[PDB]
Amino acid sequence: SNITYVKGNILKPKSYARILIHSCNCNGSWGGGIAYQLALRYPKAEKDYVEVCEKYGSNLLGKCILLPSYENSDLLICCLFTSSFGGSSHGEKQSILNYTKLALDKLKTFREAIGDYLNGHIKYPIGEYKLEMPQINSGIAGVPWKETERVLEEFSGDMSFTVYQ
Ligand SMILES: Nc1ncnc2c1ncn2[C@@H]1O[C@H](COP(=O)(O)OP(=O)(O)OC[C@H]2O[C@@H](O)[C@H](O)[C@@H]2O)[C@@H](O)[C@H]1O
């Protein structure tokens, strides 16, 4: 219903403006998984993330930041802070789903009208950007995807997601 499942590399470049959503940690570790691959291609976008994580630390749980790709005018990256440390040191599954859910709240409100880093970098109306993500949390975090799926399901009629399998 709310979701549209796609097969492919979310990282392969697209031709429409979009917002990439991935779950993150408060530790300033763009360590492994798809977080790390966004750190290689978008180093400017990493530096903002590390810098935000020392300024505010574990204060970002349940919150999201939108920061620009810098390499692509049409790609905005969006972190949802769901856990306080990257890697196997992660929080337990209930919080990460609670913290995913709150964080996506902050996004939804933002489009209906985080983005300190965005000044000048926002080519299009924010509601024109498509939202894409991998199966965030189904890897390092370990949260099965059924679980995270239904949080996105309960944002139906608010936002629509393209998910990359
Ligand atoms: N090269 C890769 N290329 C494309 N997609 C990938 C790749 N690696 C992983 N993915 C997909 O990205 C999704 C999530 O990426 P993860 O690496 O698993 O990160 P995740 O566990 O979802 O959540 C972020 C977590 O990382 C920690 O730092 C912290 O605990 C934070 O909560 C998974 O569905 C996984 O299938």
Q: Which protein residues touch ligand 1 with a CB less than 6 Å away? A: 10, 23-25, 29, 31-35, 37, 82-83, 86-87, 90, 96, 134-141
DSSP letter at 57 equals: G
* CB neighbourhood size of 124 (10 A): 12
**Interhelix angle for 93-111 vs 145-153, to 10°?**
30
Q: Residue whose CA is closest, atom 12 of ligand 1? A: 134
Total count of domains within the chain: 1
- Enclosing domain of residue 144: 1-165
Query: Resolution reached, in Å?
Result: 3.1
Between CA 127 and CA 153 the distance in angstroms is: 19
Q: How was this entry determined?
A: X-ray
Distance CA 90, CA 96 (A): 9
Question: Who's near 60: CB < 8 A, 6+ residues apart?
Answer: 26, 52, 53, 81
